[PDB]
Amino acid sequence: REGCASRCMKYNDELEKCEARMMSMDCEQELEDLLYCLDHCHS
Amino acid sequence: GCASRCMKYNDELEKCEARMMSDCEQELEDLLYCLDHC
Amino acid sequence: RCMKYNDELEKCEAREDCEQELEDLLYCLDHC
Amino acid sequence: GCASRCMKYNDELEKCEARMMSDCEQELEDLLYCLDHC
To answer: What are phi and psi for residue A8, nearest 5 degrees?
Structure first.
């Protein structure tokens, strides 16, 4: 639900940090874990 | 915190992926955009 | 590649004005 | 307000670029990290 979804913001945080690292120094693993998380909330 | 308010953008991506199995890049872009703002 | 958006942010920092340039970099990164 | 507290990270990058003209990726990473958390 909306409760489950909040626990998937942490996966966006990790993706935000990775993109910063990527513009400085792939973040596909961090996105995959975000979509996985969002997918489980959906079903 | 704001993740629930972006679930509608996941719904659209879910529906697009179903359509795709039957790019969805625009639906993901709108999900990441949503998650980014907050 | 979002490098042009980084360039603009770098140039702004050298010179609120620069949070707009970061916003356009995060937007770009969301796209890329 | 948050952004001003990230100027110190630009200072370090400016100093590193001067040293480099005489990699600064770590100094930029800490700048982008700082800007991101704003």
So the answer is: -100, -5
